[PDB]
Each structure stands twice: as C-alpha cells, then as structure tokens.
Amino acid sequence: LDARTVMKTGLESVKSALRAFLDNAAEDLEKTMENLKQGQFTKGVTQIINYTTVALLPMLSSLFEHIGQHQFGEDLILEDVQVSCYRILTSLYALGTSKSIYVERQRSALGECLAAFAGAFPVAFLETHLDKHNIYSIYNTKSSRERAALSLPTNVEDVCPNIPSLEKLMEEIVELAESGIRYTQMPHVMEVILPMLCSYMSRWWEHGPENNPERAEMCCTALNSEHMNTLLGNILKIIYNNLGIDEGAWMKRLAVFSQPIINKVKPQLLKTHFLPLMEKLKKKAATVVSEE
C-alpha cells in the first residue's frame, strides 16, 4: 500500500473506503473492549475475537508499520482518522495493561502491534503539554467550533486519559529499573510498553530540539538525546535482570524492536555503554539471547 498521491488527489469514495476500513477496525477493537470487560473470557463475539487475534492485529500492525516506513502518517490520518486511531490506541493499550489470563497468549502479537501503531502516528501522543505546537494536531485542524461539533474532548489529556504522559511513562521506567523485579509480576511494561516507547522515541527523535536546534521552545516534542540514552540504559538494566531470571524470547523480541534505537545511538555513546553490555552478556554467556 502507498497512499500519498491518493490522499492529495483521488476518488472520494476510494478515500471513504479506507476511512471505513480504519474506523471499522477501530469499532471492532471497541467491541473487544466491551466483551473482555464484561467477561475476560475470550459464539458470534467469540468469532469476532478470533478475527481480531488472527487478522485484525496483524493487518493493523502491517498497515501502521508500513505507514511509518513510507512516512505516510502525515497525510492519511488527519480528520476523524486520528479519532479512530485514538480509539485503537486506547483499546490496544487496554489489552497491553490487562491482567486477563486470556489476553496472555496473544500478548506477543499485542506488543508488536502496539509498537507498529506508535511507530506511525501524525502527532506526538505523549507531548500533551506541547502538543499545541503541532499544527497537524486534530485540535489545531478542528479549531474550536468544529472540535465541539465532533465528539472531541477538547484536551489531548482528555482524549488519551488512560495512557500516561511521556513523563509519567519515563518515571515509571526509571522506578522499574530501580525495582528490577521479575517479568511474571510485571509483564506489561517490557511486553508492550517498551516496544511502543522505542517506536515513539524513533518517531519523534528528529523532532527533539537536540536534533533540530531551530524552532526550539516551539517544538512539539521536548525530546532529549540524553533521555534517549537513559531509556536505553534502563532497558539494559532490566535486561540484565531478565537474563538473571532466565528470561524468555519476549526479551529477544524486545531487543529486535529496540535495534533501531541502538542504531541511532552514537558511536562515542556505543563505547563504554555496549562494551559493558557485551561483558554482562558474556559473563552470563549461557544465554540463547543474541544481543545486536
């Protein structure tokens, strides 16, 4: 799929087709919300769940990962597509934070779908205090009266209440590295959040004022490269704990999801940060894990 020229000049019914596909995938996710809330148990609604966990998560994952690869998040999703994908975000984060035994055996697909979603999204959904700086923001597009005419909560914190801000997420990350407790008692973060964290980090890394010095204090994302390095090091600490707790392959999938971050990290940053990582790995050499 490529859709840039379709978005600029194309058939209106064709555009309506993609809008219908996207918001249908969103309402299906909403139905999964309602079903698992009424009962965590996962025959029509069961068939809907099967459709979801077999194709809908894969199709959306592929769609948004491809959108990110081709840099298409800035044209496809502007008007009410942001609303549908905010429903999608709330839904997928709800699965990623759910404690259901049923949601567990598709949690691996959940993690790769959440990262793919966060890998491509038109606005920085974790920069609420500076999301006004983005003109692409649905609030900026809808101004005030249209924002009211649409079922828009008028606050970005209000359209994403459940998912914490970037600051809350990163303070959670640092206290998690302080804790270093085992994956079973904390599954959620290192199964879904860290992948989507890294995807968001890559998505708005260039938007960080260190990367674009111009238009600072005006940047939508107040991203920091030292913050990036701290997130990576926190991942390293918790991954040493994972290697000590016999880990699984979910952490290998974490490593391959975070490979782009350890690619954007600098060579002077590579030294004295990964040589430690290889020496931790090689003192715990009895690991199937292949870092880098």
Add this chain to the structure above:
Amino acid sequence: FDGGSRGKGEHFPYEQEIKFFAKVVLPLIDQYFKNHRLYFLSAASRPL
C-alpha cells in the same frame, strides 16, 4: 453465502467460482504483489 454459511446447503452456482477464486486468484494476488512490490510502492519518489 452468509445465509448459506450458517445454513446446511453450501451448494451454489458460484461454488466452483469461489473455489477457483480462493485457490488461484487470491494466491495469484499475493504472489503478484510480492513480485511487483516496488511498482505499486513507486509514487514518483524516485524508486525503480
């Protein structure tokens, strides 16, 4: 077929038609898009 899906009779004038579709055309679509990914992906951004 939605009525026939939950019904007993799966016999249709288009039975062999949908069988040929699912067994040939859809795999044909898969392999064809796989072979010509770049042709579709080309959007005047200087690929191919």
